[PDB]
């Protein structure tokens, strides 16, 4: 326990996809700032559980002797007893390959997603579990995604609702429960807005006894894409 | 220990294509975006493109459309224009300076090379 | 393209005292993050062109404070403040904000001796 990451359930999140490993990212909350490379542990002890955290970011690279800032914005974690997840608000952000300037180019991105991962050979036998918890996104953090599992069938679908976009008040499309690589409980499937496909979306099953359940979804709306961070309990 | 070797000079006959060099070194040659400028003999400068080595996106003016081809060879750090059809008026020093592709640094047309002194002449 | 027009193409100024070059530009040189993308150089004879000013304020490495960046969105001026036999040669303004990337026309300083 650092005091860094003690500004202000799950303990510790190491921070891998959302930071490569030529970068850093500073995080800065109350005055305080702590720098992570990738591979860090962010601790997430005094982080209280279920509410979405932000902190202030930038992502920074040497350049032959002066400090670059990539991207800077905000810096939101969802942290659940079992399951964390980071997003990325941006509010700048380097045109690296167009202009070279730096653009007030607001965008949302989701970088992590950790926890205990439920063993897929170690599911519930059978039963049904519906997990209630928070999709945010740009501008929202305060949308509510029901989430149901029927653990007979390995099987999985949802809604969203209260975002402030009504285009991303979407469905959550039934999905079979697969394993991983590392054989990982992971549901993936469509988005279905008005009765349509308007995108896809990844949850993950996480707990010893699959208690949450977290993950990314993508939407296709009438501005392009749409980045929604969702977990849920029980 | 920014370093842009440029050739001395390059003499080739009109109507002929010419390749000038601008070799790199002392910095991190992906992160920096290569500009060349052409400055005739007592006139002004004039800006010809822009070569990307982290993409290879080539941002032209539009009076040197047919007139120049940029490359970049960026594991031996180097970049090249290509002049054809070489005319007179094509007689010029050719300069190749630095600029960081990341908007925050001091790092943007502060090196530039020597210049190639290219005359066009039988 | 962005026509800079650089008024004076010569700038008298006895040694020892200031001094003015004019820079103009056909639009506002100012993008929505707030730099004003403007570099100013001096090129001495027979060299490449130095860099002198960058984000149309900002002096560079080794360039001495006598040198100064002023100007809006259209209208800007290089001021040089105690003028020395070194700083003669041709200024040249050129902008990066828009492709394709224009400079100015020159100006000359010409030291009345």
């Known amino acids: 326990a650092g005091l860094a990451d003690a500004l202000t359930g799950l303990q510790s999140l190491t921070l891998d996809q959302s930071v490569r490993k030529n970068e850093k990212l500073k995080l800065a909350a109350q005055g305080a700032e702590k720098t992570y490379g990738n591979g860090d542990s962010l601790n997430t002890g005094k982080l209280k559980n279920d509410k979405v955290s932000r902190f202030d970011f930038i992502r920074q690279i040497e350049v032959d002797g002066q400090l670059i800032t990539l991207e800077s914005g905000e810096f939101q974690v969802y942290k659940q007893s079992h399951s964390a997840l980071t997003a990325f608000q941006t509010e700048q952000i380097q045109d690296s390959e167009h202009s070279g300037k730096m653009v007030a180019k607001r965008q949302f991105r989701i970088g992590d997603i950790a926890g205990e991962h439920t063993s897929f050979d170690k599911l519930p036998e059978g039963g049904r579990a519906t997990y209630r918890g928070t999709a945010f996104g740009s501008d929202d953090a305060g949308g509510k995604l029901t989430y149901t599992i029927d653990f007979a069938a390995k099987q999985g679908n949802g809604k969203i609702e209260h975002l402030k976009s009504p285009e991303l008040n979407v469905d959550l499309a039934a999905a079979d429960i697969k394993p991983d690589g590392k054989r990982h409980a992971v549901i993936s499937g469509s988005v279905l807005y008005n009765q349509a496909e308007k995108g896809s979306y990844s949850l993950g099953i996480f707990g010893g006894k699959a208690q949450e359940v977290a993950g990314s979804a993508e939407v296709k709306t009438v501005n392009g894409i749409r980045h929604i961070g969702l977990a849920a309990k029980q | 220990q920014v370093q842009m070797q440029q050739p001395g000079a390059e003499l080739v006959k009109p109507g002929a294509s010419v390749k000038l060099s601008c070799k790199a070194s002392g910095y991190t040659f992906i992160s920096y975006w290569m500009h060349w400028v052409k400055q005739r003999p007592g006139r002004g400068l004039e800006w010809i493109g822009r070569?990307?080595?982290?993409?290879?996106?080539?941002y032209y003016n539009e009076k040197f459309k047919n007139k120049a081809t940029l490359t970049v060879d960026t594991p031996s750090s180097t970049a090249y224009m290509q002049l054809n059809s070489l005319t007179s008026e094509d007689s010029a020093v050719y300069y190749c300076?630095?600029?960081?592709?990341?908007?925050?640094?001091?790092?943007?047309?502060?090196?530039w090379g020597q210049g190639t002194t290219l005359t066009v002449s039988s | 393209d962005i026509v800079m027009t650089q008024a004076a193409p010569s700038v008298p100024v006895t040694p020892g005292e200031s001094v003015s070059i004019s820079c103009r530009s056909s639009?506002?040189?100012?993008?929505?993050?707030?730099?004003?993308?403007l570099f100013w150089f001096l090129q001495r004879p027979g060299q490449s062109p130095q860099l002198l000013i960058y984000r149309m304020s900002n002096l560079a490495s080794g360039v001495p404070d006598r040198f100064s960046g002023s100007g809006s969105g259209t209208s800007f001026t290089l001021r040089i403040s105690r003028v020395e036999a070194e700083d003669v040669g041709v200024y040249y303004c050129?902008?990066?904000?828009?492709?394709?990337?224009?400079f100015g026309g020159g100006t000359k300083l010409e030291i009345k001796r």
């Open positions: 639009k506002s040189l100012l993008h929505s993050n707030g730099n004003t993308y």
């Open positions: 300076a630095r600029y960081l592709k990341y908007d925050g640094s001091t790092y943007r047309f502060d090196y």
């Open positions: 070569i990307a080595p982290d993409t290879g996106i080539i």
């Open positions: 050129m902008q990066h904000l828009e492709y394709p990337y224009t």
